Design a protein around this ligand. Structure first.
Ligand SMILES: Nc1nc2c(ncn2[C@@H]2O[C@H](CO)[C@@H](O)[C@H]2O)c(=O)[nH]1
Length: 906
């Protein structure tokens, strides 16, 4: 019992919904929905309905949605406000599910799939779909099975069936190491020709139509490709059968380069995992290849193979198919730990939106706010359009490029959401303006107090302190829910430990697992019952506690993305509640908060250390400040510390008992200055960084805004056993930096921070020596092949032609005629190497497709003519020089008067 929806669409005058009924069965209904909208109505009938400003309204109820749209359009032409939920899907969901949705995830068909398409050049265009689909793995969550569709005959090669028994063997028995926990879950179907396979897959899709559809890049490649492929071979009518409502929209997306095609399948919610990860991971990443993220998430990765992916089928079909399966599995494993599908499902059902709408803060919040106001008989405002006007962003301090021995950092809790609550910023809490001074005047508390009666932002805006506001209200709701679910997750952690206690030597009874709520700390009587409990039952309880812990995590990450979504939405001109004044209010208040507390921290540390106008805050970014503790350490005396932990202890205690109290005083004052609704500027200690005691390491350094390294010992009270390097914007991770130089540069930084100049100097000479010995692939830089056609004049480079594009040209010249070498494609990644003067390739560099060897035809000639000197200079030394000059060290020992002497020592 308790129905929930699966997907909803509007097609003309009916709502097409897929849903789970009271019985638990998946059904489909078509509803000729009758929307309601609102007009302002001079209160001649004692009305229940008011807009967010308190103006009375009247309800108009329409025969069909099409009429409703006409009306809006009519109303707007006249100049009148068309109030209410103009997205009827949302209105429908709100009416039909006018309760808190409880959903059973096991009844939701979640498909995870990937395809393979062999093409002579290896990068086949989804819009054109010239090439046969020769492998599909489709995982179904309800069946818990991997359906594998294998093409045996292609124009590009014919192959034997894949072997499940070979797939299961270890690498050294010539196997693929497809895990046992899925080996038995594979249903393998080979096909003699593509038409067979596609027809079977399409029939398969009708029987098991995905509600939620996902995978890696399914939106930009896999879905468009199968759709076009089917359309091409069978016709559009057939391809449309991929939508349960037989409706389809093809959308063309022109990015910063060419274009791309996206297919909307009506009645299906596509949540591409790559986007799901980008949104919910809250971790910046140098690459978003499934291979890299698996590696990051699961400490392993995608299957490995000899040669280009475009040659894998012909050379190793066995691996080809296993690799495809594994790819689908990797996503499942990431989801196993990250839980982004369930998060999307929570959020979707929490807001009452199409599930794919979780990608859109403005859509989600539009819905959340609509439902909230609906329970109060309040009416939402018509959305009017606004110009895209650039307004202030975050404050980033320009740092003095230098080494910084001891650094301590602090950041504000959840800054923009905190500002919204503190100032009381909402479209309807606006109370007026004040004559505004330069921002620096407020930072310095020199400008006059804006208002004695209203809550103010340094941009000139005033807000009511007494009145509520939709934005601040809705946000504080989610804030509390976050605190609440966080609490559950923690209690489920502590309870899990209690159960892990009893598991070390439990009773040999025949009993059952206790029926308890894991979201709450166990009572003493429960703790006692647990001791005298069997291993069978305790293991069931530990599983239960951890399912609850996971639920807590997910629910509170949900609230986190929700909270930050709103903050971002208010800056988005497409948001029903957007207002430039309110967006500037938020960000300008931000900048003041950061520079004000910078001033206070400088004032405090000068007083406390007895120094004149000293710069303690060396850097800040958006919500965090970076404090040089060098003077604090001197004032004590460095030699007074017993070990590294001793000074880290000291800086912690100093942060806790001295700086934070001061910071809080500082922000309380700021709050009074702006006369805000409540004090919510909470800053506390983040990191403590420095060199190990009695080393010659430099601790950290900045080279510029967003470019710095720190040797971190402690993060928010947790002490690391090994110190952790925090590196930012230093090209240690850019795909462009060659793999070996990436490791090398990080080692240079590690030694700088931890060990000092001499260590760095010894490692530099060492790496320089080992350089000419490294695999050529590990030392090539990586670029993107963009606009090759543009700079291709006959066969030679053109005007102002990029270094890497020139390389691609010389490669294609050198492999021309011969049709047996891996070709370079537009919008693909390429390795690049410099060539020495007067080489047979007639240019100073060459480039080939990444993840491939150079073809044998020319490999050794290339390698022989490589310009290591230019290579090491451009990729390694230049970057390093940037670091060393900023830190004021030398990576090569400066000449000495002693150099010429043969000593026994150092
Ligand atoms: N309270 C409220 N109801 C709305 C609004 N927009 C559309 N409606 C619809 O009008 C009806 C109110 O009883 C419901 O069917 C709602 O789905 C709105 O802005 N506020």
């Amino acid at each position: 019992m308790k129905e929930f929806y699966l997907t909803v669409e509007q097609i003309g005058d009916s709502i097409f919904e897929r849903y789970i009924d009271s019985n638990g069965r998946e059904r489909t209904r078509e509803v000729e929905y009758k929307p309601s909208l609102f007009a302002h109505c001079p209160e001649s009938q004692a009305t229940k309905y008011f807009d967010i400003y308190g103006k009375p309204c009247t309800r108009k109820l329409f025969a069909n949605m099409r009429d409703a749209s006409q009306w809006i359009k009519r109303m707007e032409d006249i100049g009148l406000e068309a109030l209410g939920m103009d997205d009827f899907k949302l209105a429908y969901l709100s009416d039909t599910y006018n309760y808190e949705i409880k959903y059973d995830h096991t009844k939701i068909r979640v498909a995870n799939f990937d395809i393979e398409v062999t093409s002579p050049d290896g990068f086949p265009e989804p819009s054109q779909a010239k090439h046969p689909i020769d492998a599909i793995t489709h995982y179904d969550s309800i069946d818990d099975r991997f359906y594998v569709f294998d093409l045996l005959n292609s124009p590009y090669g014919n192959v034997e069936e894949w072997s499940i028994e070979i797939a299961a063997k270890l690498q050294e028995q010539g196997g693929d190491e497809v895990p046992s926990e899925i080996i038995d879950k594979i249903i393998y179907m080979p096909f003699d020709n593509e038409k067979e396979l596609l027809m079977e897959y399409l029939n398969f899709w009708q029987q098991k139509t995905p509600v939620i559809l996902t995978g890696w890049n399914v939106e930009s490649f896999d879905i468009p490709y199968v759709y076009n492929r089917i359309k091409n071979i069978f016709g559009e009518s057939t391809a449309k059968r991929l939508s349960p409502h037989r409706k389809t929209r093809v959308k063309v997306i022109e990015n910063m380069y060419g274009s791309r095609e996206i297919i909307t399948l009506f009645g299906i919610s596509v949540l591409d995992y790559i986007d799901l990860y980008k949104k919910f991971s809250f971790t910046n990443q140098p690459s978003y290849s499934l291979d890299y993220i698996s590696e990051f998430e699961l400490n392993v990765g995608k299957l490995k193979y000899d040669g280009p992916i475009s040659k894998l089928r012909e050379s190793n079909h066995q691996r080809y198919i296993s690799y495809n399966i594994i790819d689908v599995y990797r996503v499942l494993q990431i989801d196993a730990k990250r839980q982004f599908i369930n998060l999307s499902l929570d959020m979707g059902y929490y807001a009452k939106i199409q599930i794919q709408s979780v990608f859109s803060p403005i859509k989600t919040w539009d819905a959340i706010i609509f439902n909230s106001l609906k329970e109060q008989n309040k009416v939402i405002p018509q959305g009017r359009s606004h110009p895209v006007q650039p307004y202030p962003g975050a404050f980033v301090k320009e740092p003095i490029p230098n080494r910084y021995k001891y650094v301590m950092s602090f950041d504000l809790t959840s800054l923009y959401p905190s500002i919204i609550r503190q100032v009381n910023i909402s479209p309807e809490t606006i109370a007026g303006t004040f004559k505004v001074a330069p921002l620096h005047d407020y930072i310095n508390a020199v400008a006059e107090r804006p208002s004695d009666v209203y809550s103010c932002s340094p941009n000139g805006m005033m807000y009511y302190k007494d009145r509520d506001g939709v934005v601040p209200t809705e946000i504080t709701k989610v804030f509390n829910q976050r605190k609440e679910h966080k609490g559950y997750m923690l209690a489920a952690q502590r309870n899990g430990e209690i159960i892990k206690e009893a598991l070390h030597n439990p009773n040999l009874s025949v009993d059952e697992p206790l029926d308890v709520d894991y979201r709450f700390d166990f009572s003493d009587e429960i703790k006692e019952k647990i001791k005298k409990l069997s291993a069978k039952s305790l293991n069931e309880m530990l599983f239960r506690a951890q399912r609850t812990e996971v639920a807590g995590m997910t629910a509170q990450i949900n609230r986190k993305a929700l909270i930050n979504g709103l903050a971002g939405a208010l800056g988005n001109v497409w948001f029903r509640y957007y207002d430039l004044r309110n967006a500037t209010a938020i960000t300008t208040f931000g900048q003041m908060a950061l520079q004000w507390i910078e001033r206070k921290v400088n004032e405090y540390l000068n007083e406390v250390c007895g120094t004149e106008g000293e710069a303690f805050v060396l850097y800040g970014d958006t919500d965090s400040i970076y404090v040089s503790a060098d003077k604090i350490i001197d004032k004590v005396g460095e030699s007074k510390f017993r070990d590294t932990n001793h000074w880290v202890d000291f800086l912690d205690k100093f942060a806790r008992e001295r700086m934070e109290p001061a910071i809080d005083r500082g922000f309380r004052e700021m709050c009074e200055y702006m006369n805000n609704k409540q004090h919510l500027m909470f800053m506390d200690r983040e990191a403590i960084a420095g060199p190990p005691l009695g080393s010659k390491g430099i601790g950290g350094f900045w080279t510029g805004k967003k470019r710095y390294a720190l040797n971190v010992w402690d993060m928010e009270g947790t002490r690391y056993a090994e110190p952790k390097l925090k590196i930012m914007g230093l090209e240690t991770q850019k795909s462009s930096t060659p793999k070996a130089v990436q490791k090398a540069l990080k080692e240079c930084i590690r030694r700088m921070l931890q060990e000092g100049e001499e260590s760095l100097q010894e490692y530099f000479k060492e790496f320089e020596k080992e350089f000419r010995q490294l695999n050529y692939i590990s030392i090539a830089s990586v670029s993107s092949a963009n606009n090759i056609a543009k700079y291709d004049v006959g066969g030679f480079p053109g005007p102002k032609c990029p270094f890497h594009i020139r390389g691609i040209l010389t490669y294609n010249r050198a492999i021309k005629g011969n049709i047996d070498a891996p070709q370079v494609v537009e919008g693909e990644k390429v390795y690049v190497l410099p060539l020495r003067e007067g080489n047979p390739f007639g240019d100073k560099c060459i480039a080939w497709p990444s993840g491939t060897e150079i073809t044998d035809l020319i490999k050794d000639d290339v390698l022989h003519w490589m310009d290591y000197t230019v290579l090491l200079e451009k990729t390694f030394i230049k970057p390093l020089e940037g670091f060393t000059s900023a830190a004021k060290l030398d990576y090569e020992k400066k000449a000495s008067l002693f150099d010429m002497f043969d000593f026994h020592h150092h």
